């Protein structure tokens, strides 16, 4: 059958655009990428591996009030920092299969991607969606089966402050 309405481009002449655009920033300490920063949610949550690794020095000094028990921030940053980061989250899309890896399955309480990188300073990168909402922040993962199980801190409409699989490496 056909489409009997449109509210957007009915057709295309080539592909030269990308469906979602990253907004991430790598973050340096001794000139090395030891995480990725973004400044997301309503109240701002990122630090777990960018506690040490500076976003901007002023910003580092400014933010901290934390639950260092599980490493979750409950302090927030300016609007200035916030616009330049990935889009904010308040709900969980689970229909998303694009960020940086080819498919994101949520089943059996675990996020998986197919067998990927798990090399130093890949930690703290957000898992961004097709409307760029951040569903999870990578703490690490461990490869098994043909998939990579991920360890995450979450905050959407449903939330667990640090949760880990049976087997894990510190990425």
């Amino acid at each position: 059958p056909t489409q009997k309405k449109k509210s957007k481009p009915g057709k295309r002449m080539r592909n030269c655009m990308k469906i979602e655009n990253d907004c991430i920033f790598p973050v340096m300490l001794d000139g090395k990428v030891n995480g990725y920063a973004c400044l997301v949610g309503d109240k701002v949550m990122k630090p777990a591996h960018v506690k040490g690794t500076i976003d901007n020095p002023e910003l580092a000094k400014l933010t901290f009030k934390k639950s260092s028990k599980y490493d979750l921030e409950c302090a927030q940053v300016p609007v200035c920092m916030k616009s330049d980061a990935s889009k904010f989250t308040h709900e969980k899309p689970e229909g998303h299969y694009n960020w940086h890896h080819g498919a994101v399955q949520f089943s059996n309480g675990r996020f998986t991607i197919p067998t990927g990188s798990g090399k130093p300073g890949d930690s703290g990168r957000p898992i961004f969606d097709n409307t760029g909402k951040v569903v999870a922040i990578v703490l690490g993962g461990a490869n098994e089966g043909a998939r990579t199980a991920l360890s995450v801190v979450t905050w959407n409409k449903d939330m667990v402050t640090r949760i880990t699989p049976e087997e894990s490496v510190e990425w």
């Binding site: 028990k69 449903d158 939330m159 667990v160 402050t161």
Partner: protein, 52 residues
């Protein structure tokens, strides 16, 4: 040390059983209030992780 009569018996508190001895003893509630606050917070974290 005012002076005001009191009993000279039974428990050892060193002016013994006195309205003053009881009033000094009433610190005992302070350690209990700070303990109720610790119990609640320790059990409540464990409960959150489980809750979601």
């Amino acid at each position: 040390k005012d002076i005001v009569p009191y009993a000279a018996k039974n428990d050892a508190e060193f002016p013994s059983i006195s309205t003053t001895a009881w009033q000094w003893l009433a610190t005992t509630s302070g350690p209990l209030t700070i303990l109720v606050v610790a119990i609640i917070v320790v059990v409540v974290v464990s409960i959150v992780v489980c809750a979601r």
